[PDB]
Amino acid sequence: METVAAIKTLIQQLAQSTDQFGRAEINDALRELQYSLETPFDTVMRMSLDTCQVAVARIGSDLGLFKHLSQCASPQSAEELADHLGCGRELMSRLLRYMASVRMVQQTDDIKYISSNITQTLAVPGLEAGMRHAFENLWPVLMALPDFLAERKYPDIVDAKDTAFQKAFNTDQDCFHWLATQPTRIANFKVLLTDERTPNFLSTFPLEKELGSWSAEPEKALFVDIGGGMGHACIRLREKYPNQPGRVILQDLPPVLQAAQATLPLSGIESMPHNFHTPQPVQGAKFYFLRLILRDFPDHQALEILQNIVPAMDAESRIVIDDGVPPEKGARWAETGTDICIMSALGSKERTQRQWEELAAKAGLQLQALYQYTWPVVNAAMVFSLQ
Amino acid sequence: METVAAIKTLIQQLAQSTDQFGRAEINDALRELQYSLETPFDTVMRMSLDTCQVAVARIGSDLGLFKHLSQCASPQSAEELADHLGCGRELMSRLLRYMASVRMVQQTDDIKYISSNITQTLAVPGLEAGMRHAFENLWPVLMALPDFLAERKYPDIVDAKDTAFQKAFNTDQDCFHWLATQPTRIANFKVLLTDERTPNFLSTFPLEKELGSWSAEPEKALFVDIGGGMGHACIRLREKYPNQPGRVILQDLPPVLQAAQATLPLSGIESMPHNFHTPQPVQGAKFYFLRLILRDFPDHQALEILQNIVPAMDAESRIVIDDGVPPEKGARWAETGTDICIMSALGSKERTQRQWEELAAKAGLQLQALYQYTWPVVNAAMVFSLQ
Ligand SMILES: C[S@@+](CC[C@H](N)C(=O)[O-])C[C@H]1O[C@@H](n2cnc3c(N)ncnc32)[C@H](O)[C@@H]1O
Ligand SMILES: C[S@@+](CC[C@H](N)C(=O)[O-])C[C@H]1O[C@@H](n2cnc3c(N)ncnc32)[C@H](O)[C@@H]1O
Ligand SMILES: CSC[C@H]1O[C@@H](n2cnc3c(N)ncnc32)[C@H](O)[C@@H]1O
Ligand SMILES: CSC[C@H]1O[C@@H](n2cnc3c(N)ncnc32)[C@H](O)[C@@H]1O
């Protein structure tokens, strides 16, 4: 209709007028409008059928469909794609019709297919690995959660070894120990670590202000990236602040450090094997950095991780927790759905600012500053000192 | 910000101004805009987390939360709901924060909780049963589909006994036969049958034109509702055309007829046990009516269902197929996701108009008229005659 076409034009123009945070606000508003305007039948159909997207994306990934379509220079028929990818022709046609209906691909007026933005996204290895993680790891845990809670009379989940994960995968191990026995899941996780989120904390972190008159002499450490994965934070730090002296150290387990060597700069960033359940070896660093680490642990274990760092700190040292800080009320779906998932798989939780401060106070830490860098979903670098 | 509030105001006014079909078009446009404006990370987070809605709706149903909240006269704290419903207080608080973020409930400015439109929807028994069906029946089949297809080198699914269902539930039975052996699932399906879709075919079906000079004597049947469930079509027919002569007959299996007695009118509608895989007993009826029946069967079995009716027809008899008629191109998510689901569970498929005509021609039937009654997703009463 002319009205819906005009709605689309105006929302597209408003989205172009603003920045990425304004666009995120607009998208959340579109979701709220959808939910408020759907009929009861629509609500049930949406909940029933939006499930299809993850399974169908998993199939397209298995087939290599999104990568292939992303590199195509002209629209492709369903028969061409089926023959190229080794898929039944009718199966491929039905899959593509569904995918086009949810913009996973685009369907042309002559019933051929081209890449959409979502096609290109699912072709990126790290983002593809995120979707595959949702299918193979998250889905079974969420499928097990309702009956787990029912059988246990709805307990408050507090223990990584006693949550829905153990029911879903028929094991008594916690998720992290179980994963070490699953090579294909490990391989997918290694690809998942190559995804770099944007924006990052350096977009708003006032580094020179927080540094003050800290001296890197004689040979002190500026930045210790604890569980840093591929070291993206270290790389971006050296990129934005190339002249700031001090050691920059990536700490992780040996297999992921080995994976990180391929893309690490030739010099300037150390790779130090370190298990963050053991005392922090680097003494007196300016910043001990924990990005998306503590969210994966219940309070008692997250506390242990902080307690292992505290003895290494001097008066100028800071622990920087870079993580989600959802609000007391009005939290968005992308910071509450995470909470349900990490509850069900890891026994952990999202933490408000007050909850972060309580946890850190148990380690003897005090919040000095908080630097938000995403909106409306809150990710922030929280700077803690001793006392 | 102010912009988001203005978008909501204007879209709400436009939605109020139009009818249900215009609102459905607007909602589809809002979904398309959301998908087109999300970031790559947003896409993966959405696919990862929208899954949570079905699991959390199942938990809320298990707790009786939506029915309870729907009958509350004031906002309720999370502690009050937890204590009343027998749920851990922190678990209840986290569940409610997530539900509020996806409008499954509403959160007030003082962090209490009231019903939303979706709360009320999930409190309705038939719609609740739809959500429970999505969780317990659809989700396992979709979880099994990618590896089923991979192990079988991506076959065209054509057989109700050889699809993802058999892997999901570790059985050689087809879905309907297996479900008949599962009493709790049967009970849920009986509640699901009490949901009546709106609008229905009588909103556009020119009954008097199709009847012509047809005579109901001697004791002939006007309308035979084959697999009619609770008999809603019979009830609405008698309601809209109370003076039209001719028997009106609800045909289904005995347990469903028994369930239907509670809500059936005291006179005017016959309850006749009949299995639609067997020859049709009522001879020379004007309309043999099949609503949302044939979509659940692959072509050879749907053909058998029609062939069991054809010998009962005289020259004035018509078979009326009331079902989805998705377009050749540009089909919507609510008529393609259905296709993927019924492929994976039942071996069946959605059918375009041309595919319906091919199938019916195998039974000796010819399309006379097609009366659409929903938009933009196509449901239509297709009228077939002999020859
Ligand atoms: C969320 S991932 C990567 C987060 C990373 N800081 C980032 O934002 O780029 C968590 C990281 O913690 C690492 N890790 C898990 N257990 C660890 C342990 N016991 N000691 C050190 N690192 C660990 C993983 O190998 C992984 O690289
Ligand atoms: C989609 S449901 C209800 C459809 C119904 N026409 C309506 O629109 O409400 C399918 C119906 O077919 C019935 N059914 C399933 N197998 C049947 C059979 N073999 N013979 C007769 N009815 C059957 C079920 O009991 C159910 O009522
Ligand atoms: C976008 S990739 C991260 C997504 O997967 C979920 N997730 C990530 N890592 C884990 C993990 N180790 N265990 C359980 N869920 C996870 C998070 O809720 C998020 O939605
Ligand atoms: C509102 S319920 C409609 C849903 O029922 C689903 N469905 C799949 N198999 C069956 C079945 N055997 N019985 C009833 N509904 C089913 C379809 O996928 C559709 O999304």
Residue numbers in the entry:
A (entry chain A), B (entry chain B): 1 to 387
Structure paper excerpt:
Recently, the novel multifunctional S-adenosyl-1-methionine (SAM)-dependent enzyme LepI, located in the PKS-NRPS gene cluster for leporin biosynthesis, was characterized in Aspergillus flavus. LepI is considered as a SAM-dependent methyltransferase that can catalyze stereoselective dehydration via three pericyclic transformational processes: intramolecular Diels-Alder and hetero-Diels-Alder reactions and a retro-Claisen rearrangement. The overall structure was found to be largely similar to that of SAM-dependent enzymes,28–31 exhibiting a core α/β fold of alternating β strands (β1–β7) and α helices (α1–α19). This structure exhibiting α helices and β sheets comprises an all-helix amino-terminal domain (NTD), a carboxy-terminal domain including a substrate-binding site, and a SAM-binding site, which is formed by a seven-stranded β sheet rounded with five helices.
To elucidate the mechanism of LepI action, we first determined the structure of SAM/MTA-bound LepI at a high resolution of 1.7 Å. Two molecules of LepI observed in an asymmetric crystal unit form the homodimer, which is primarily mediated by the NTD; specifically, the α1 and α2 segments of one subunit interact with those of another subunit to form interlocking fingers, and α3 is involved in the formation of the hind surface of the active site. As determined from the strong electron density, SAM binds to one side of the LepI pocket and maintains the catalytic domain in the active state through interaction networks. The adenosine rings and amino acids of SAM interact with Phe276 and Asn275 via π–π interaction and salt bonding, respectively. O4 of the ribose and the tail amide of SAM form a pair of hydrogen bonds with the main chain of Gly227. Specifically, a hydrogen bond forms between the S+-CH3 moiety and the main chain of Leu292. Collectively, these interactions result in the coordination of SAM in an extended confirmation. Additional electron density was observed in the pocket of the LepI density map, located opposite the SAM-binding site. As MTA could be detected via HPLC analysis of the purified proteins compared with the reference standard of SAM and MTA, we modeled MTA in the electron-dense cluster and found it likely to be coordinated in the hydrophobic site, with some residues displaying significant conformational changes upon MTA binding.
